[model samples]
Target chain A: IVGGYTCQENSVPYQVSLNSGYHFCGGSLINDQWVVSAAHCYKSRIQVRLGEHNINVLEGNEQFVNAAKIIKHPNFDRKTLNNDIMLIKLSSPVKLNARVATVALPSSCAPAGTQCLISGWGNTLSSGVNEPDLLQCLDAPLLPQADCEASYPGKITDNMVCVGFLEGGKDSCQGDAGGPVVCNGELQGIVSWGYGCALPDNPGVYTKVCNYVDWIQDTIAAN
Target chain B: GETDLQKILRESNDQFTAQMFSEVVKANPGQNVVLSAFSVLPPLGQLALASVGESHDELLRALALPNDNVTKDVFADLNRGVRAVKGVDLKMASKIYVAKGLELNDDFAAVSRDVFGSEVQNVDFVKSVEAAGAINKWVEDQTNNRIKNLVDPDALDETTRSVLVNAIYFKGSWKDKFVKERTMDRDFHVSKDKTIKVPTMIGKKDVRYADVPELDAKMIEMSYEGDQASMIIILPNQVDGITALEQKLKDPKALSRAEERLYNTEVEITLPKFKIETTTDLKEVLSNMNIKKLFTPGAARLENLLKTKESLTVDAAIQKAFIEVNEEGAEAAAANAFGIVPKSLILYPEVHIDRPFYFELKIDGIPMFNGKVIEP
Candidate 1:
């Protein structure tokens, strides 16, 4: 989260840290018992903490729950990192409150140049240093489809969209993977892979949530 | 469900495998060594049944078998089950060669045939060269020629009254085979300071994996074509960590705990292509593990084996083993939310076997071959 500010506590209630005693990746609470994250963060045992703001200090609002089942996209490719979405079924549902809630899925894709806020507890510098204890948020705009494809050349596919600045001062670095990209108060993207942290000509790529909405709903319903 | 005897036999085999491996690694430090404890056990069982007094007691204890109340018939039943396991090409055979004119006790012959599934043959050891060739040829044929020259003519003589041989052969392909095109020469850290280039096989597979804190290693299970067997690799976290890992494995339950923690997941694997062929003196290795009197000529009591008054002791207990791991197989086989921005997360977990590792080839929960690949 280079070029971002420390977010206010409980401002992003849906935000969660995928923790195995330490935050490895981030996720979003999509429903009472379901969470959305990136397939790249898949691990055997994961605990999701919702309503988390200061990860180091105990905030009474935090709801810790175990992941009962983790389902990575069937087509998720480790080579290209395509179809990077993953869903986690929590062992138990958390109560919805002012400090704990679910985020709405996008009705449709966010148009190019739409303003989106991406958040995480990742690095705040391009030099791979300074991981803050508090959550950080960056205001990024969705790049046009043509520009997104142009930046990655043949690598970008429909399941992905680029966000952040081309001049590249503001972007997600490491540790922010699977965190939310919220546009119009809905999850529009998931922070995924890139060439480097906030580098010029390399904006952060995300899993296009709009393309996986039905799949997410169907998976949640079946499980 | 296993019969009570099968359970006993399985546990005994596991005990032998773990204990034997501890001794093997100690004797040959920093070298690639492979031995089939499963192959070595039955021949010892044959000797155990043919001996009396301390010789009989020591052999049974070395094989991890109960000294009393267990019969040759029960052992035979378990051996039959092991051979009956389907889906893999496995062959286990035992043969006893005695000098001509030395009549084998009929009771010992019957027990050997019915219990150990061994055939007793009369050969003239005075012609030691031809005798060694015949035994080595039998071993070569049984193991698909992977094991050769298992017996030396110099080790056999007119003084050699009898010889006991056990050879086991296994051949199978991976169910999820590594692609040959993806194999590339990669740098292998033979030691912390030295490096060498070796052909490495790479693939992304949903393998049974675990991170064992107790052993300070990561283990993975790769299944064979029939799913009846798997090769479990326990790789130490450090390049020079093999000695510590082997020491931890002295407790037989250390590996069993790792097996219990295995969960299937997709992992990017980078493993070196290795083929190891080793010939070990079973007498020396087994004696170190306390199977002594069977190899000690005067102390050995074989009151049941030979009809004559002469004492029979095991002269040469040799085992030749071969294993090849490569990019080959047997014929038949998310979403996200966002939050405040973030910085560093590991992309994914990749298992690169560029250092030394310990491997076990298992069939139906039976450890067939165990080895340490310190250099390979």
Candidate 2:
């Protein structure tokens, strides 16, 4: 899917609908109490909804809640995507059910050529009002860092992973940061940042979840 | 074990070295920096001995030293301690040259030779260029040629009355040397997204190691052959954590914290084989450090340094330092010149010093040198 279309209900259980009075970006429920997302998607007042397959029509499976705390990585630098991840602690733990189950964190990296699917209700156009009303899924492969470096040299760091099409069709764009990139049925990366949304040559960059498993766990333990 | 004199100097030396490293890092932009505040201190202390009123007191205050009668005794003991150091080729020397035909005060001359072992000589500063050359040669000789031409031509002009010089040379081999074959070029993280290939030496040695989570850093201490001196390396866990780590060093108890955490442990060592030669002027730096009176011609007093009324203030102060770390060990030297110029191994985590790190060289817990390697 290029600029992915609407998907079925309950397909991506951890997929979250995040808002600060508007659907600016998507996030993922790592567990009942925490949402794992990009620090660049940081906002003072944020609201999250789980199992919201479509926004216009009320889905009874949706679980709405406000954030109790938003914790960004101590080393988070907005200069680039280094340590782009953040953790949002829910005001109260959500009741874990089939429609709102926590996604599993990847213990290791996905293979270089492994296909990963990223779902979001992000913008369908690069610089236009094309944010989808229904959640969408786009299937793309995690490309080698060298291939992605051909366009954005020296911008991608170890904290991030590159995923997109060589011909530049299927990609994650604006309004999609802090979303999930699933590989082999495990939570692999977060839609952290990018140069241009769904553009040619440049890949949609994500915070490498595997690389930060320890950091995420440590931060959660600390707070 | 530390004597009363060593304990007194250690606190100020640590603070001064840390402040010097931080100041120069800001002064020199985009340069690999290495300096020895310890090398400069001998001459600085000598100058303090030769000043009167606010000039000398300001110097002591800036160095975090209490101006007291024990000053001379402290210098005498400090001189004895450096020479008594074993297992290292270490040299610390200082001297003063007066404009020809000017004799030093009898008390000043006696203290210079007896207490500090510094010389008071007569040189014709009327011929400024020749005098500068002569002084520079002496500095070069003192530092084993590691420093050359420290004094600029005409630096000793007609008005110049007295010039102070201090030089230090050090060559220390690691207690457990790394294998040369294992020394290879590896990526050194310069920043969050920058890496440069530099020759690195790897070895596993039982050394004093520590992992300080409170500061979010790890460190190790590698002693020199004689067990007299050790180089302590502090590495931060975050790639760009040097800033925070530097701030932590400002804490008065940070040095004690390092000393407390350090214990003998097996560590996997990976340190870059790098060399640095850097020089800078420190008058402004010293002034900024709260020793401003010495640099002010009118506000300064030096009846003790020179028995003259020529009104000579410290016109310039300069320091040049060199260090080379390799598979075998480290060779380093520094020279300080008062034209009159004034002027870390630190933090965050595990033993791999693959990023920007701070190192402090200590002999019997007394600072000999401190350096910050941002790019090496």
Candidate 3:
């Protein structure tokens, strides 16, 4: 959030706000009703609001929706947030329009050195809880797996993806989790967790979307 | 909160702690040892006020009280200071019981109030079960139920005119609480050839630490939520190094130097979740600590305590302590009653408690529970 600004209304339609009593985490709408997010955010019952721009004011452009069910991955490891992905089933199908749309998922790995934009409402300051109401989207370059492994040591695994500056300064901090990493407008990563936001040599971690494509597709098809 | 007052309290506490820990080890050789010397000190101090000659001198020497420098007012201040900490729930209660219609001397009653911060209760020791139950309830109340049943009914009998008690309880979550989501089961080495599975709490945080090669131990201090209290884990580098570490701690200045060496450092610590509790009859332990007179009946001199001269002396002195360490901060309680008859592993440079370890909980640098976990 350090190098981000208010995302233009309808700029990234798949971006969604997840309100669990209050907004602290985000989600990505795969289609009209289903949203993919980090399982750690499934601590409470959630409400999904699609097409939200400025969260401060309840505008007509936003589609407020109820979450009917949440399914966390059976093998998700809470100890390290491994396989951190979760899916939310909407109470009803959302109305698709110019302000509300879904983003396509990546069928394969995001090539090394891919430039992406992370959009969420995470904190702008390092350890501060001052999360703003406006949606934030910033440019982050995806690092090679070897570079990511070096940054996290043995903690980094195949299920996670690393994106941001190795020299630090920009990140998706607390409350800005589970949002979309739009690599060429394709869903490539879902904000998971990290040591902290924007610390030097520590990139923000995310669930590698490509690894879970089969599970996501199979679960959504049966539902 | 005078600087001198805190220093005075801390040094006096360290003196008592240093001697008391030595006694605990001597009494329970090659077993898990833990004692709340501070919890036992106030009542001993209160009773010391009642004794005239030999009993007075022994209690003073046992607790290493220098002259009359730390008076009743000082103890009252100590009690007040501990109860005032934020976030950490800490409290102490001292009580003296006597047979019905038999009252303490006027001087004894006043000293009990102003110095010991206790109220005298009229109790019937002829009915020992009910008497012990009542004393235990007071202990349970003071310690937030961490310690109950402090007195043994078998120890009490007719003519058990006086029973003095002091109970202190502490509970606090770490300011940087361990993430329960990250804790895992790890093997704990009981000895050179034995191991047991224990849930180990893990964390990566920069905290106050010291590397002491002289003691062959690494020290890490993690503060409780309020910063008024902290739990220090002293991990011996060798599997059986606690023997040497205890010897090093016997010299108070060595521990003082260890405290001075503490500086903020990056650490990823793995600590085993464990709890240990014990109730020991310290009558023998005290004698071994060279406190011989009070238990000697006639040789003892508690003449200032009673107007009804029945050869008053300490029938027995009992100490009961409880401690628990987990993903949350440690919760501990101890009761020192004058009963006439009473973790871990290593990963990424961690302070693993896989083997036996020693720990101390302190507030404002004054030691509370000094313990060793030989098994867990």
Candidate 4:
């Protein structure tokens, strides 16, 4: 996450590192056996690490489990980037503790201009700096849909929401995709995509998770 | 965590295993081979314990022992550690069967039983057929009947003083087992121009893998249940690259160097279902490793083993091994793909063992058994 502070261990207990040999994306633990990620972060096989504060070292608190099933949203569009959410059923259920727990899924969408927390192990710079070893958290305000649609004409959809500064100093970047955007302790958004990552007039776009609460619940119940 | 002694022992055993594998494969080319120095070492260690003078020194050198000061107690601890591995159904047994007429040394018998974990029993070698049957039966029992007819009656005679034997049995299931339904027929390259269809097991999972550019080969390691044991398979980049890979394997540290580069990642594996049953004569293999004195008639000195007027010497050393590779692995402590409306994305690498490859099973960094599969 760009322009963010290092998150303390166990602070963001629901954050998970989605690894395909290397840290490729971030996810949120919504339940003991399931994770929510971006459909764009889809891979044939993914190893999810829970209770991770540092990606490069074994912290002794991390639990690794492989994805038994990858459920990408059926309506996900690559070109349009709509319905970009994904669900992963873990091969085994993890024991939740103080260091790891499930985040609450929002029942309704957050109002525009509400402050939210975005966290991930992602590149902090658009150019030089590499992905941080420690997880980073940024507090930003959700932009009104009117301004969000104007930033990326024809690219924005009703399923998407925008967050971060319009002046371009703070936002999610590459490798932060699929991470959580929390408002009032509820999972309100998922890191999706953007133009150039925190650029002027190019605030970060995210999947509006509140719109899919019924779908997520139905899928979990059916599967 | 390993103690200093365990690390040292592991390194030495690895050296011995690499040397023995090279020698065995060198002797037999283009043939599927399966062998274990871990199984053969105990019997030789027993000989070292029972020997004196030149026989002692020669046996010690051949088995990579530090010196003649090495005792049966070392082997006792080594075997216990080796057998203590969890998650895999692994077993090893060594026994010394002396001729019925020979008067065995009481101390030798007691040390063999207590320190070496080897039992001493009397068998009538004058009746070579019955002695052979008894030995074979014991071998069968030790290996869960995976190996049989290990001893030939013709090899035993009236002059036979004692028969030293060791047998190892292992059966382990994969931690992430390959689904049996995923197994299907796939094309296997026996040569650059020739191919055959074989039942190959396929699955995608997170495994430790490495591309050893120095050897122009790739390696993958999969753990067994409980992570106490693992199997690593090496496949060459070129279809006919097994010869070059084999040449590089002559170096004892080649596999270790490759192992050091491995990192965890997702891989799609395609492996064939195969089985190997091998019977090896250790006399020749041991001699090639500069162990001629132990098998020589008059040069052999086994005075501490028996209280007999006639000089006793080892005439033969043999090992019979068996292994099977299939989709079945132990059910662990505990998959799917869909979607695809995307383009321009790179796919995770698929490691297809379509041609010849080499595999070795290890426990605590000690090579248990290694083999080459060319025609599987």
Best by DockQ: 1
lDDT of 4 by residue, B1-376 (tens): 3364466556667777887888788777888888887777777777787677877887777677776454454576765655454557766666777788877777767777666667778898999899999998998887778777888998999788766666666567787677665678899999999999999887665689999998899899988777878888999999999988988988888988999999999887888988887777777788888777777776777777776624777677776667778766743211112121111112366888998998888875778888899889
- The Cα error of candidate 1 at residue A11, in Å, is 44
- The models' CA-based lDDT, in order, is 0.81, 0.73, 0.74, 0.80
Worst 10 residues of 3 chain B by lDDT: B335-344
Best by TM-score: 4
User: What pairs collide in candidate 3?
Assistant: B343-B353, B344-B353
Q: Which residue ranges in model 3 land beyond 4 Å of their true spot?
A: A1-180, A183-223, B1-4, B307-310, B329-348
Docking class of 1: incorrect
Better of 1 and 3 by lDDT: 1
Judging by TM-score, tell me the better candidate of 3 and 4.
4
TM-score for each predicted model, relative to the true structure: 0.61, 0.57, 0.62, 0.63
Model 2's CAPRI class is incorrect
Worst 10 residues of 4 chain A by lDDT: A122-131
Write candidate 1's Cα lDDT for A54-121 as tens digits.
88999677889999999999999887878998899999989988777899999988899999999999
Which should have the higher DockQ, number 1 or number 3?
Answer: 1
lDDT of 2 by residue, B1-376 (tens): 3367778877778778878777877788666777777766666677787677878888888666777476666777776755645546665556777777764676677677777777777888888788888888888987878878777864668677665555555566787666565567888999888888888876666688887876788878888777877887888888888878878876756877777987887766888876777665666667767777766777767667666544556666767666767656533111111111110001122366888887767777776776678887
Which sequence of candidate numbers ranks them by DockQ, best first? 1, 3, 4, 2
Model 2 quality (TM-score)? 0.57
DockQ for every model, please: 0.14, 0.01, 0.03, 0.02
Order of the predicted models by TM-score, top scorer first? 4, 3, 1, 2
Candidate 2: tens digits of C-alpha lDDT, residues A75-161: 887776578888999998998877787888897788788888898877565432355778889888888978867756777788778
Chain A TM-scores, one per candidate?
0.98, 0.94, 0.96, 0.98
